[PDB]
Ligand binder design. Sequence first.
Ligand SMILES: *[C@@H]1O[C@H](CO)[C@@H](O[C@@H]2O[C@H](CO)[C@@H](O)[C@H](O)[C@H]2NC(C)=O)[C@H](O)[C@H]1NC(C)=O
Ligand SMILES: *[C@@H]1O[C@H](CO)[C@@H](O)[C@H](O)[C@H]1NC(C)=O
Ligand SMILES: *[C@@H]1O[C@H](CO)[C@@H](O)[C@H](O)[C@H]1NC(C)=O
Ligand SMILES: *[C@@H]1O[C@H](CO)[C@@H](O)[C@H](O)[C@H]1NC(C)=O
Ligand SMILES: *[C@@H]1O[C@H](CO)[C@@H](O)[C@H](O)[C@H]1NC(C)=O
Ligand SMILES: *[C@@H]1O[C@H](CO)[C@@H](O)[C@H](O)[C@H]1NC(C)=O
Ligand SMILES: [Zn+2]
Lengths: 596, 49
Amino acid sequence: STIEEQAKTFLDKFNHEAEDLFYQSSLASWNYNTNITEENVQNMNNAGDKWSAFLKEQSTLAQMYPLQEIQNLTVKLQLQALQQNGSSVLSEDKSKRLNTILNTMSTIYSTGKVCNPDNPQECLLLEPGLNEIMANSLDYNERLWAWESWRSEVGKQLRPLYEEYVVLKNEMARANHYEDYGDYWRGDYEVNGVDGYDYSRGQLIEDVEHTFEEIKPLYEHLHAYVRAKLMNAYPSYISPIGCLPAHLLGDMWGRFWTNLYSLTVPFGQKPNIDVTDAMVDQAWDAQRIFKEAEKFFVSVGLPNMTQGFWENSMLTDPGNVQKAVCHPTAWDLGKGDFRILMCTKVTMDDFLTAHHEMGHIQYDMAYAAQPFLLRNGANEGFHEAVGEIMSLSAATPKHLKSIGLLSPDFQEDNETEINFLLKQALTIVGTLPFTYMLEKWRWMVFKGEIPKDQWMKKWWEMKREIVGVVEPVPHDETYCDPASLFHVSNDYSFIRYYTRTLYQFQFQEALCQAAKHEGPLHKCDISNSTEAGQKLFNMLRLGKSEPWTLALENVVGAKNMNVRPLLNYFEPLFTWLKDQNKNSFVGWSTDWSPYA
Amino acid sequence: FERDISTEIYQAGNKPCNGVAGFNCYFPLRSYSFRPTYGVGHQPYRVVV
Ligand SMILES: *[C@@H]1O[C@H](CO)[C@@H](O[C@@H]2O[C@H](CO)[C@@H](O)[C@H](O)[C@H]2NC(C)=O)[C@H](O)[C@H]1NC(C)=O
Ligand SMILES: *[C@@H]1O[C@H](CO)[C@@H](O)[C@H](O)[C@H]1NC(C)=O
Ligand SMILES: *[C@@H]1O[C@H](CO)[C@@H](O)[C@H](O)[C@H]1NC(C)=O
Ligand SMILES: *[C@@H]1O[C@H](CO)[C@@H](O)[C@H](O)[C@H]1NC(C)=O
Ligand SMILES: *[C@@H]1O[C@H](CO)[C@@H](O)[C@H](O)[C@H]1NC(C)=O
Ligand SMILES: *[C@@H]1O[C@H](CO)[C@@H](O)[C@H](O)[C@H]1NC(C)=O
Ligand SMILES: [Zn+2]
């Protein structure tokens, strides 16, 4: 009886019990999500507690297996994900204080309340007031006041908690044999034991730095264009070569540039392609939208889908008394059960969103035969890097005309392509430097290269260099600006979005080459391309049994991050951005600030 | 053409099981635990040969 045989015998029963237990936990959570009631809270809490206890007991039982004596590169992978000692190495007091820290951070972030001046009665939360003001309101005074209030009343409430969280995460990383908590996050991509395909955590920093440097020339052109367009709206607020103010970035943190499309449009006389009025005219409903999506999906060779999806999952807002969350969720309960939740309304936004979720569950069902511990993507970017790309390809005018939502009389003119590319760049291109510098700052804070007294003192140079953003009011170390984000308070890695953005465009080159599509990359449709469907399914079906490098080789034939598809997508756009920026300074200066 | 009804626990290790559930000694019988929401390929099937 070898050690590998014992590990396999344990893992068979572990997977068999864990599948059913996670199915029970998932159904308990789904019942609460689709029906918010007092009994469902208790049911979900009990299911979660039972699942956590079972996982902890199984991990303690499996701690006796040393990882050195398992061959086959498959059983050891499950043991690595099962052991996961994490914070349990430390004492129980340090675990409960971590739980308290996370709970208080989440509570403080959720209870963010801002009260208008001269009236301590009409206070507002993040939504729907502050969010609407940050997304649509253009007044300098109100935006500055809201930004200052949100970064003041929340930063100090978490700054000592942030310090203690950083210190204890560093202690946990040291106890788990890690250089820092940044490496703890980066450990997802690490690949070992495979000849010619090994990966290291440290190499990821260099890999992302190189691709950021190669992306850079595409970013400052867009930034200069945005600044030039904003110069016509705020003539006495932006320096000609200075950085843009923090609260004039289109929202509260400046992560997305898409909120300024109504102002930074080069051609305001050409409306975009919106066929929501069309589907209103033909009395399109949720069922018709889902049938059209299924017709699109069957065209690439994907198999049929079980009737239980239609019977069990709800796809229409109930309204009335029954209150349920409307967040788009794809539940993979396991054991052949797949559900999707939407509050479908008559809008093309829901039509585009359903393309994420239906392909998302298509990916989920691909790895059904895999062990329960390996029913995930090879990395955190493979999960729906394809699910997003089908949604992007569904917006092509060709398929819109084919399905009858757009009349054939829509003659294609190059005016629309430039506007569409600029709108896409306001969401994808702009966010890349901001995400990169935020991830780098968090990595440096976790590693400790940034001193305690200069977390913000070092914070504002990257804003002046990587993203070209300058604060409107100077702040000392008392404030904690980064703490006002969703991910930092919930302890989530922020590089996932950047990696997914990098991965989505890489697949498009292979998908369009297989489909033999000709023309611009953003007008590429994967319809009637069943060969590309088989090619993508061959990668979707591997699940977690194979390293992410092998899956990346199976689509494009590489072992490192590729940015050439990113330039290929915006290749016509970059040349035009070379034209209107010839009379304006491309870039920004780090010496001037709006507050002087 | 054989039927097994014995419920003796399988021994996956060198030490004797001693009739107690634990390391390398698991109960050989497991329950289907069927639910109406199972998939097409996981639903119960009545097989006669
Ligand atoms: C994919 O192929 C299908 C059928 O092979 C196309 O559906 C037909 O499209 C033509 C014009 O493109 C229409 O006149 C027909 O009414 C459609 N339905 C049929 C023939 O049943 C579909 O347009 C193709 N999609 C793309 C993007 O080329
Ligand atoms: C939601 O829960 C309530 C009480 O728990 C129940 O009366 C109601 O029937 C449930 N909704 C549905 C659609 O069954
Ligand atoms: C790994 O284990 C599986 C059993 O799940 C077995 O079929 C396979 O042959 C093993 N790999 C090798 C290289 O023997
Ligand atoms: C934590 O788990 C790892 C995983 O095997 C183990 O090597 C280590 O000894 C454990 N540490 C403690 C304190 O239990
Ligand atoms: C099932 O898939 C086939 C393709 O093999 C397709 O022709 C058929 O319409 C699908 N069935 C449904 C109900 O969509
Ligand atoms: C579209 O193409 C024509 C001819 O190639 C050109 O004159 C026109 O300027 C182009 N449109 C834009 C917005 O550049
Ligand atoms: Zn998703």
